[PDB]
Design a protein around this ligand. Structure first.
Ligand SMILES: Nc1ncnc2c1ncn2[C@@H]1O[C@H](COP(=O)(O)OP(=O)(O)O)[C@@H](O)[C@H]1O
Ligand SMILES: Nc1ncnc2c1ncn2[C@@H]1O[C@H](COP(=O)(O)OP(=O)(O)O)[C@@H](O)[C@H]1O
Ligand SMILES: Nc1ncnc2c1ncn2[C@@H]1O[C@H](COP(=O)(O)OP(=O)(O)O)[C@@H](O)[C@H]1O
Lengths: 426, 442, 443, 28, 436, 111
């Protein structure tokens, strides 16, 4: 029984077709019957390896941003790591600039002017300016009068981190607006609440639109560290930029302490719980697929990225009662990748090059991959690459008594051109 | 919710042979425009041609927005229909091309098919283990039914969804794996422990029977712009709601285009093309028209529905004057549906349909007076007078609105032309265009 | 089945080997000299030795400049970058117009790199921290070392990480019993999923389950990548990817386009030149298509005549629709194609010519076959007469509504009655303008 | 043979335990 | 050189001048404009003297006469270690910075400070690294054998070196450079032990060196302005640097020059198409050259009596009168036939294979007739159509083919004039249809 | 406008007990079976037997004997108003303001 199925070119297969079809002047060589005629031959095998499937001639590796780094590599009872990624751009500074502008010095006036402009003349100083501090203490209801001097002299990220939960004075002019009362009244609220359900629409839109199972669609192409600054001949610059790149309060704030460690200080070392360095302030990503930019190569993308393997797995899903064979000369002896495909995911009882007697005792183990009187197999899938039907008939001569033909085709590729000349020859 | 100016139009009033009925689906008149709008609707429902610009032309008070909104009503649910106006493009955070691109990406939709799993049973035992600071969580949940019992592990999101809307042993809950939703159906065991804090006890439900894990497949619709902004930044889900998304790079656009085509070819996604409707498109700028004429030539571009009420008018940002305010290169791309003014029978049908939708019992002679007023002045004035006349009849305690209510409403409220004559009669009382006025009576 | 986007009928320039143009190939009808000039330009691109060569595709509407630009992109191949643009893109409310221009210029220039990455991956059997000595001091981290047990097929290693690596390890919520993937180039780590050695039918978090990774740990993998020069610039200006607090904080912020300084571009060029000479980089210069160049004002053209004269600037192609018009941004300079005379000396004008009736008829025929609607001959001739009479575009856009009316009439054939009904329902620009002229309601 | 369940390392943690008859809380 | 393709000014390797500043007729890729080239040589010797502050020169003339070529020749003949900033008139209209701020940044990018610093460096090949990693506590010890062609020595390594060598994993045979002060090792490569590769280092380990550092004043201004780090030099969000830190940096630079640990190197700022600046920018330039730390500004314009932007009156060269008063003007002239022939000869010599002589004469005739730049653009496409004919040389008929295809300005203008209704005019009128 | 009902317990805490449990698991500092709290208001006094999960909210919010508190039924989250008016015992120096003893019953169902 003869059947034929024709398939559309998939997206990655078509883009590989176009990028290796361009060249300089190909003049459509493979469909100019160069395979029929007898460099041209290199283009012919390139077009064949593209037109079958990508992973039969190069591996689809991981999807990662390009690491713009100069990390410690190797030439190839524990192996240890230190994070040593640096940008290749080295901005070099003279030592005179640092040692005469940034650091204090006996002939420099950095520390004196710093104190004189930040402490002696700060308008929130209670030692000189009491009434202004008392003015804001009446306004904002602050318990301590040095708090304005503390806020005025603290970096923004650090001031964000040590956020105080202490309530203010109750005689203040800080009158809590109705939106703050609405947010605080639903801070830990159940469902089936009238004010509860009004004030969370993002969680309703999350649960309704199934955002917990969506996939990553974009990854950046290049990822880089901050550009390294390289001052020669000083360790103070090394200490300063190592402290600024890895400030332990900021790094620990974007972190989490391990649980057995929290056991160790809370019970074993007796540290009070509120004196822990605070953690867990890094924002939660939208999904598990959105956590990191590295994308693993998926088995299902191997299944779906081919014009012919998709309909092939559809066909062996449909075909169960008859053991079948594949002409592996559609890619010139490529057993390996189909082997990995059908013992990775589509696992079956299998035999591949006593060998001929194993598949006739029972049809549960299929004959599967052989390179072309063994017609005792129930069927055989011989499909294309035949610009000559002589090898086709000699392959089906080897092949129960019933023979069945399964033909595969891809439109737009060279199979239409060799398989329209050879169609009239049959 | 509320009755608006376009409350009555439910469909395009169209038969299956693309021929408009005289009066159906809350519409009347404009038979050729209705047939052309139905042709565009069938084009959208086929969904295989991209970037067909359609322009509607006509005088004001003709039914252009009624035609477009009838297209949106008959278009069916879960297919996108943006209804932007011309003035909304000019922003301080986006560029105009960026705003047009975002409207274009909003108009095109993706029907993601997802495989999910439902569990529903009687909760046996919870074993939430938390760290000292409470940041890291892991637990074991145990749930049974009449048939069988299973022990499941727990993650961070499931534990925090169990904590909020707090679940005790004795409850019947339902969990969807793909969305992570928690639905406490009620309390079944009715346990003897009654803490004095709990005052809200859920209603009794019979504990469920059958297998816990039931396979389920669901489909949800997300537009291209939402996927674009979700992949744009780390916190992109907020930027749907706050709208702080902006000047999004072209890299995420092309990568999401490739990924969308990928999800299309493996069968995960089924793209439904939508309709972008730009009311008062004469309000736009020449740079916007340039981007519009170059933006319809992509595969991810919807059918664009355009409306104008201008004659030969000045194209904005330019010295010259063009038909409909639209330049010639854009006018050549578009295909124009025309609309023509009404007569007394069509206007009578309009106010009858409106007063049916305005729950007003109007007398026949008052209806004739309203039709003469509508032909005399405008359709919108006689549409607006019905609710006022209803209120006046309510003040006199009669349900049926009569002729004297219509005359009192006509005397109390002024239309366009009478107000123009009243301004022209005693123009010194109003502030002149040169800023001159006389505010004293002597 | 497949959506048509007014250009799907175009597959290439359709030239022959010697540079001559076949009359029918690739969906092109006519425009022989334009196709030959564009093929010469494609050959010049594939030479990959020039910088700042520019052409202007002069012509009227309905002529095929945009078609020629996408034909250039189809002939060149997806490996060499192609950056389409509209002239209204260059006006941004967040950064200068000129910096948007140079950002598109370095979007056009491509790169081909091959990089080897040190990779650690395997199943997490052991994960035990080491506590610090003085935890409440806060000037060090709360831990000192983390010992990690990684197991895969054929190899098994124990991993004593720095705390900064364990930051990313805890940020991906790595538990015991999942397959992970440490990239040692940047310190990023990806949690693949829970290992399938254990039971996989009792979780509630729809996790994906992965087999044990093949090969040893400490796999050194070489991958090939295609990036642009602009993407290097935007990665170095906004440094996301490191494991320092600058990079972790730079991920969270909303990005704004900033004026990328020239010094960054010279440093990126020096690094790329080192990659060229070291042997893993090969430069792929590309093509940038500024459509509607009349909309650009005098400032862009004034900066453009200097930006084209640099050593790295790609080949830009330009399209103009207008004739003898005034330049935007000025009120006295009257110049051809909306292009100032300073730029026009750098520019190589490629003229395009309007169509005849037979060319219009064949274009309608091919567009109908691409849209999978078969037409009758008299209806095609009628549509050709309307295309000569109204415009080619109106005859193109009318093809789908008569198809819709044909499916309405329960037949697959387009007749002249469907064309007449498309005339009666929808109108072109000319009849609409006359209807505006006769009416007094400012219709 | 049916694969073993995943190891459950809960050392170093407080415990919420809610049962049919009564609810517990183990703390530190 | 970085990555450089063939550009318009690529043949220019500097001013073709002798020792007495007399221009050779054709040297260093540049031919003609001998009075202008002598003037540019005098300005070059001004900049190389470095004792004159804040002069402005105006290179004015007809289009395509080599003004940008003259400026590129000055920049090439200046060499490196002298700052050069070439901006256009459309750059300084910033959406974040003011016009005078962008002009001040461009002024201060072309003034440079030269500092000589002597550091310490140890660079050799690792024979063998051993670590006695018996970590009873946090302490570890190890020894390092480092070799050059004339050195072979063993070192006792402290704990911080062991930490620094654990990362950047050094094996035996690798070539490393150690900075003892900062503890940063750099892996230059692996030596010749194949059985990326680098040569084994020469002798005298632990050799001090002088690395001459030249930084501009803009970078010192960005650093000293305290809330912007050095990442502003790459990100570009410097954001309106205040005047007081500029005054502090000027006083510190004067102190460094007086006490002799820094040398100031003046540079050249080039403004291409200066006619697009506003009158405010002309006022700031008008009063910006009186600072002692002001570079030698080059301005190039090709406009006649035109309007000044931001005003409504006309002025010579597109510039106001006081700015023309505060600048000396270099004039440039057009080219005759032989200069066009020499320029096309040089550009075709560098750009591609040789031409037949009659084809070169046809190029010279076309360049005289239409434009020099049009013929220079015709050169490459004529060569490409010659390769499509599969011939090495470029004949006359390839030039005829390229002349038929690629139009110049005059043919395009004329052909627009006979086909007017097909195009769109100022009033937006166009006959798209071809019938009647 | 939205109408609803608020089922709250308000008063002054006179005694709160982290009550222990039989079979106290293993290797745990405490094993709280329930928390008994004794509330006092104007002409009202109640003893509330709460779930154990209110204990960590109590311990976080510095809820001790001699304070006026205000809880919710269904959420079970404590909100400490302050100390009671009468127990201004540290009469020399104080910081926390002394709320008067709250009116009404200990159990209120307001709308
Ligand atoms: N065919 C129609 N069917 C129903 N209502 C209509 C029809 N034509 C006009 N109207 C009414 O006329 C009014 C004007 O129509 P609309 O398009 O909204 O404004 P305009 O015509 O001024 O653009 C609308 O309130 C609409 O209800
Ligand atoms: N040479 C051609 N062959 C076939 N179709 C063409 C050709 N030139 C233009 N077209 C068609 O005419 C339409 C206009 O093309 P485009 O270049 O985008 O606009 P314009 O021609 O006005 O620049 C396109 O839809 C295209 O399908
Ligand atoms: N004297 C010259 N020597 C060599 N090449 C020249 C000379 N004058 C002009 N050119 C070339 O002519 C082309 C255009 O000249 P250009 O520098 O734009 O003139 P201008 O600066 O006056 O506009 C450039 O490629 C330049 O190399």
């Amino acid at each position: 029984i003869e059947i034929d199925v024709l398939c559309d070119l998939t997206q990655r297969q078509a883009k590989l077709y176009q990028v290796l079809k361009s060249q300089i002047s190909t003049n459509y060589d493979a469909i100019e019957n160069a395979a029929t005629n007898d460099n041209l031959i290199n283009a012919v095998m390139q077009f064949r390896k593209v037109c079958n499937h990508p992973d039969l001639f190069e591996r689809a590796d991981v999807d990662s941003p390009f690491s713009f780094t100069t990390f410690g590599k190797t030439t190839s009872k524990f192996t240890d790591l230190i994070y040593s990624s640096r940008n290749p751009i080295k901005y070099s500074l003279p030592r005179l600039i640092y040692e005469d502008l940034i650091l204090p010095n006996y002939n420099n006036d950095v520390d004196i002017a710093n104190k004189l402009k930040n402490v002696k003349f700060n308008i929130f100083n209670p030692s000189t300016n009491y009434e202004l501090c008392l003015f804001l203490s009446k306004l904002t209801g602050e318990p301590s009068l040095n708090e304005f001097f503390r806020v005025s002299t603290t970096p923004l990220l650090k001031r964000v981190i040590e956020r105080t939960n202490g309530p203010k004075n109750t005689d203040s002019l800080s009158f809590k607006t109705i939106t703050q009362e609405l947010l605080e009244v639903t801070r830990n609220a159940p469902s089936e609440g009238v004010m509860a359900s009004l004030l969370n629409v993002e969680k309703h839109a999350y649960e309704r639109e199934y955002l917990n199972c969506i996939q990553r669609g974009y990854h950046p192409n290049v990822s880089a560290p901050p550009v390294t600054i390289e001052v020669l001949g000083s360790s103070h610059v090394t200490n300063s930029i190592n402290n600024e790149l890895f400030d332990p309060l900021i790094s620990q704030a974007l972190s989490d302490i391990p649980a057995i460690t929290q056991y160790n200080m809370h019970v074993k070392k007796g540290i009070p719980v509120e004196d822990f360095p605070k953690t867990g302030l890094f924002p939660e990503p939208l999904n598990k697929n959105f956590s990191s930019n590295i994308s693993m190569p998926s088995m299902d993308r191997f299944i779906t990225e081919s014009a012919k393997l998709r309909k092939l797995d559809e066909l062996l899903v449909k075909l169960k009662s008859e053991g079948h064979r594949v002409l592996i000369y559609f890619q010139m002896t490529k057993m390996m990748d189909l082997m990995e495909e059908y013992l990775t995911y589509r696992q079956y009882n299998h035999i591949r090059l006593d060998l001929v007697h194993d598949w006739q005792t029972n049809p549960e183990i299929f004959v599967f991959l052989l390179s072309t009187n063994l017609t005792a197999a129930d069927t055989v899938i011989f499909y294309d690459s035949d610009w000559n039907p002589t090898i086709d008939s000699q392959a089906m001569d080897r092949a129960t008594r019933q023979v069945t033909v399964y033909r595969l085709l891809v439109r737009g590729t060279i199979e239409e051109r060799m398989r329209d000349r050879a169609k009239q020859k049959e | 919710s509320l009755i608006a100016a376009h409350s009555h139009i439910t469909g395009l009033g169209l038969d299956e042979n693309l021929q408009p009925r005289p009066t159906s689906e809350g519409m009347v008149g404009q038979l050729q425009a209705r047939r052309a709008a139905g042709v565009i609707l069938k084009m959208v429902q086929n969904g295989t041609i991209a970037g067909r610009a359609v322009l509607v032309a006509g005088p004001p008070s003709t039914g252009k927005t009624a035609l477009a909104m009838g297209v949106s009503q008959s278009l069916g649910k879960d297919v996108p229909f943006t209804a932007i106006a011309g003035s909304e493009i000019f922003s301080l955070e986006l560029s105009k091309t960026e705003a047009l691109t975002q409207a274009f990406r909003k108009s095109i939709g993706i029907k993601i098919k997802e495989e999910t799993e439902l569990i529903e049973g009687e909760v046996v035992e919870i074993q939430i283990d938390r760290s000292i600071t409470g940041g890291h969580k892991q637990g074991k949940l145990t749930i049974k039914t009449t048939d069988m019992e299973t022990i499941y592990e727990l993650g961070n999101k499931m534990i925090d969804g169990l904590t909020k809307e707090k679940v005790l042993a004795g409850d019947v809950i339902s969990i969807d794996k793909a969305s992570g939703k928690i639905t406490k159906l009620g309390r079944s065991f009715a346990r003897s422990r009654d803490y004095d804090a709990m005052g809200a006890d859920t209603r009794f439900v019979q504990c469920p029977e059958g297998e816990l894990q039931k396979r389920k497949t669901v489909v949800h619709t997300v537009s291209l712009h939402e996927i674009d902004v979700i992949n744009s930044r780390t916190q992109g889900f907020l930027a749907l709601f706050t709208g702080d998304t902006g000047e999004i790079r072209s890299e995420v656009r092309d990568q999401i285009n490739t990924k969308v085509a990928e999800w299309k070819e493996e069968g995960k996604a089924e793209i439904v093309p939508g309709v972008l409707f730009i009311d008062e498109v004469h309000m736009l700028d020449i740079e916007c028209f340039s981007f519009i004429n170059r933006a319809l030539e992509d595969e991810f571009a919807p059918i664009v529905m355009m409306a104008t009420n201008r004659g030969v008018s000045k194209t904005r940002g330019t010295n010259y004057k063009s038909p409909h305010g639209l330049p010639l290169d854009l006018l050549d791309r578009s295909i124009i549906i025309t609309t023509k003014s009404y007569n007394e029978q069509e206007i009578k049908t309009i106010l009858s349909i409106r007063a049916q939708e305005e729950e007003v019992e109007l007398s026949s002679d008052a209806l004739d007076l309203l039709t003469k007023t509508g032909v005399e002045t405008s359709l919108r004035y006689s549409s607006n007078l019905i609710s006022v006349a209803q209120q006046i009849a309510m003040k006199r305690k009669n349900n049926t609105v009569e002729v004297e209510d219509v005359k009192r409403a006509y005397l109390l409220f002024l239309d366009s032309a009478r107000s123009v004559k009243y301004v022209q009669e005693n123009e010194s009382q109003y502030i002149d265009d040169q800023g001159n006025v006389q505010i004293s009576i002597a | 089945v497949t959506r048509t986007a007014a250009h799907t009928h175009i597959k290439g320039l359709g030239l022959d080997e010697s540079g001559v143009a076949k009359r029918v190939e690739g969906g092109f009808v006519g425009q022989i000299e334009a196709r030959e000039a564009c093929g010469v330009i494609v050959d010049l691109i594939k030479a990959k030795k020039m910088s700042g060569r520019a052409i202007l595709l002069a012509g009227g509407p309905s002529t095929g400049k945009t078609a020629l630009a996408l034909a250039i992109s189809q002939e060149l191949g997806p490996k060499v970058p192609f950056c389409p643009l509209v002239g209204s893109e260059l006006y941004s409310v967040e950064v200068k117009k000129t910096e948007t221009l140079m950002e598109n210029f370095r979007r056009a220039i491509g790169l081909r790199i091959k990089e080897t990455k040190e990779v650690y991956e395997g199943e997490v059997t052991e994960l035990t921290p080491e506590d610090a000595e003085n935890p409440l001091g806060g000037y060090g981290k709360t831990i000192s070392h983390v010992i990690v047990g990684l197991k895969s097929a054929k190899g098994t290693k124990t991993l004593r990480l720095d705390p900064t690596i364990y930051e990313s390890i805890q940020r991906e919520k790595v538990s015991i019993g999942d397959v992970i993937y440490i990239e040692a180039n940047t310190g990023a780590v990806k949690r693949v999923g829970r290992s399938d050695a254990y039971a996989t039918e009792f979780d509630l978090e729809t996790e994906e389950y992965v087999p044990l990774p093949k090969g040893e740990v400490h796999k050194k993998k070489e991958i090939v990548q295609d990036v642009t020069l602009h993407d290097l610039d935007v990665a170095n200006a906004r440094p996301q990817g490191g494991q320092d607090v600058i990079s972790m904080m730079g991920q969270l912020l909303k990005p704004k386009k900033t004026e990328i300084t020239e010094k960054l571009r010279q440093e990126v060029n020096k690094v790329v030149a080192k990659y060229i000479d070291q042997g893993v980089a090969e430069l792929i210069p590309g093509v940038l298509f500024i459509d509607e160049v009349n909309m650009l004002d005098i400032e862009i053209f004034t900066y453009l005549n200097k930006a084209l004269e640099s050593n790295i600037a790609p080949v830009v192609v330009l399209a103009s629709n207008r004739g003898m018009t005034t330049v935007r941004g000025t009120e006295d300079v009257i110049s051809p194609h909306g292009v100032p005379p300073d730029l026009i000396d750098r520019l190589l004008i490629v003229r395009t010519l309007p169509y005849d009736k037979d060319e219009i008829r064949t274009i309608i025929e091919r567009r109908a076959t691409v849209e999978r609607l078969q037409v009758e001959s008299s209806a095609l001739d009628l549509l050709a007469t309307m295309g000569t009479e109204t415009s080619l575009r109106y005859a193109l856009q009318l093809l789908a509504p008569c198809g819709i009316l044909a499916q309405t009439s329960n037949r697959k054939e387009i007749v002249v009655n469907d064309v007449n009904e498309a005339k009666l329902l929808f109108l072109d620009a000319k009849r609409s303008t006359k209807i505006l002229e006769t009416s007094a309601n400012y219709l | 043979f049916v694969k073993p369940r995943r190891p459950y390392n809960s050392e170093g943690m407080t415990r919420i335990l809610r049962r049919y008859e009564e609810d517990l809380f183990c703390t530190f």
